[PDB]
Structures are given as structure tokens and as C-alpha cells.
Amino acid sequence: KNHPMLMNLLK
Amino acid sequence: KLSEEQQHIIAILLDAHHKTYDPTYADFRDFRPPVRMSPLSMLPHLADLVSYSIQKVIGFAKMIPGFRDLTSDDQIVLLKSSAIEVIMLRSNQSFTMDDMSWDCGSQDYKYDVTDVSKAGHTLELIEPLIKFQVGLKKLNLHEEEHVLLMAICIVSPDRPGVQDAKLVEAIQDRLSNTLQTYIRCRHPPPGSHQLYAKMIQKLADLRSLNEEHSKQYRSLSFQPENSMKLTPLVLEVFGN
Ligand SMILES: C=C1[C@H](O)CC(=C/C=C2\CCC[C@]3(C)[C@@H]([C@H](C)[C@H](CCCC)CCC(C)(C)O)CC[C@@H]23)C[C@H]1O
């Protein structure tokens, strides 16, 4: 449900 | 003819692709090494390759004009659904019809049907992907066309779970009109023959390869022994 790594690569 | 805004989109996409695609393949040395004799002896190496490739596609995506101006949730939906398809597209740059392999600069990093089958995939699904690569290679795309197509693929407003489909469609339409105008202004005949139509058909073919992969991934990774050989990012992006 959460996407910590994908989020971090987008930031 | 090509406006300044359409030339600007292209310039941006070229720059983005150049900084996220090393045509020397130097980073592959850092992957788990290929083993071609477990039985899935290639799975560690090709999982790394995929995971590395997801990173790169994300770096390319974030540069697409307007993508970063979508909500995070919609950015994540678009990348999760398109990641395999853009890996497939971008791989066309190493793919060679000489042998039907992906040639990344050395015998160790040359990948054929057999290699992919030792990563857990049936010859029956691998075959359509090789046929896709051939058809795409035959288009002889200009780099400008290649990158625009990768971008149109990512900003597709029909992916399930997209909330601002209109915003996504506004982007995509700007890319698409950029692409059409480019083929007409810069691509000489007869290579330009129905080229837009053919490029868009590749996107449809990619939906099919995606759907088929989705099911195979769900089978492979359902097995804890296999999932253990993947990467954190692959698990997060394609699912656990
Ligand atoms: C940097 C590069 C590209 O990002 C990726 C690349 C090659 C791409 C390949 C060759 C090996 C097999 C790959 C990784 C395929 C991969 C194993 C998929 C399954 C993993 C998807 C998450 C095959 C799925 C099939 C088509 C068998 O259903 C897709 C693209 C294929 C090398 C280079 O051009």
C-alpha cells in the first residue's frame, strides 16, 4: 500500500 | 511545423534519456553476476537489471514536462503500471536482430531467449517480447521519436486508479501532437509511412505484454524462494 522507495526516487 | 514549445519538449526528453541511459552499460558490473550453466540461475542478475532499470525509468519520468505537477498518488499509479513497458521500450536500444539478443557490450551482458528462460519465464511469453523488439527495431526510430514514445507510454490516462485522468491526458496530448508534428516535419519518407500509427500500435502491444507478465510475476513471486531473489524496489513496484 505504501511506496516509500518509489516516493523517495520521485522527490 | 515544429513550434518552440514542441522543440522544447523534445530537448527536455533527450536530455532526460541521456542522463538515465548509459549506452556503455558500465553499471552492470555491480549487479549480481550472470550464471548461464539453479535452475533459475539468471534470476539474480536479471532482477538487478530490472531494478536498476526501474530506477532509471523513474529518473526519466520525473523529467517529463508536467509529470512532477501531478499528485504523488497519480505519479505512483502511472509508474507502477508503465514500468515494465518502458523497460521493454528502452531495451530496444541494446536489442539487435543479428542474433535476437540484447547486447550490453560484452558476452557476459548479452541476453538471449535462453538467459531469459533461466529467470523464470516460459518460452511462450518470451517469444512475443522478441517479436515486439523486432517490430520496434524495424521502425528505425529517431532518438526523438523513441523518447517521445517512452513518455507517451508513462502518461497514459487510462491506467487503472488514476484520479486526474484529464490532467494526465492533457500531458499526453501535448507529447502526442509533438510526436505527430515531428514525424511530418523531420522524418523523411518513406520511413515516415504511417509511422505514428505504427508507434501507437506498439503501445497497444505493450499493454498485452504487461498483462501477460503481470500474471507470470504473480506466479513467480508467490513463491518465497523466488521472491527472495528479487530486490526491494522490484517487490514494491511489481508487488509482493
Ligand atoms: C538498460 C537496459 C534496459 O533498461 C533493459 C535491458 C534489457 C531488457 C531485457 C533483457 C532481459 C529480459 C528483460 C529484462 C525482460 C524481463 C525479464 C521481463 C520480466 C521482468 C519484468 C518486471 C520479461 C517478461 C516476459 C516478456 C517474458 O513476459 C523485459 C526487458 C528485458 C538492457 C538495457 O537496454
Q: How far is the CA of B86 from the centre of ligand 1 (A)?
A: 10
CA separation for the pair B213, B219 (Å, rounded): 10
SS3 B96: strand
End-to-end CA distance of chain B: 47
Please tell me whether the peptide bond between B33 and the residue prior to it is cis, using omega within 30 degrees of 0. Answer: no
Q: Which domain holds residue B133?
A: 1-240
* Burial tier of B223 (Cβ tally within 10 Å: 0-12, 13-18, 19+): exposed
Could you give the count of Cα atoms lying within 13 Å of B160 in the half-sphere of its Cβ? 3
The resolution, in angstroms to one decimal, equals: 1.9
Asked if the Cβ–Cβ distance from A10 to B237 is below 8 Å, we say no
Ligand 1 interacting residues, C-beta cut-off 6 A: B 46, 49-50, 53, 84, 87-88, 90-91, 93-94, 102, 104, 111, 116, 119, 121, 125-126, 129, 209, 212-213, 216, 238
Q: Of B55, B68, B236, which is closest to A3 when you measure between CB atoms?
A: B236
| Method used to obtain the model | X-ray
What's the total number of domains in chain B? 1
Where on the phi/psi map is residue B139: left (φ > 0), alpha (ψ -120 to 50), or beta? alpha
Any idea what the CATH number is for the domain that residue B234 is in?
Answer: 1.10.565.10
End-to-end CA distance of chain A: 18
**Which residues on A lie below 8 Å from B80 (Cβ)?**
3, 6
**Residue environment code for B176-212, b if the CB has 16+ CB neighbours within 10 A, otherwise e:** bebbbebbeeebeeeeeeebbeebeebeebbeebbeb
CA separation for the pair B43, B36 (Å, rounded): 10
SS3 B56: helix
CA separation for the pair B189, B87 (Å, rounded): 29
CA separation for the pair B138, B141 (Å, rounded): 8
A4 CB near a chain B CB, below 8 Å?
yes
Please tell me whether the peptide bond between B34 and the residue prior to it is cis, using omega within 30 degrees of 0. Answer: no
Longest dimension (CA), chain A: 18
The reply, when asked if residue B146 is annotated as ligand binding, is: no
Q: Of B58, B59, B68, which is closest to A6 when you measure between CB atoms?
A: B58
Contact B52, B26 (CB under 8 A): no
* Burial tier of B45 (Cβ tally within 10 Å: 0-12, 13-18, 19+): buried
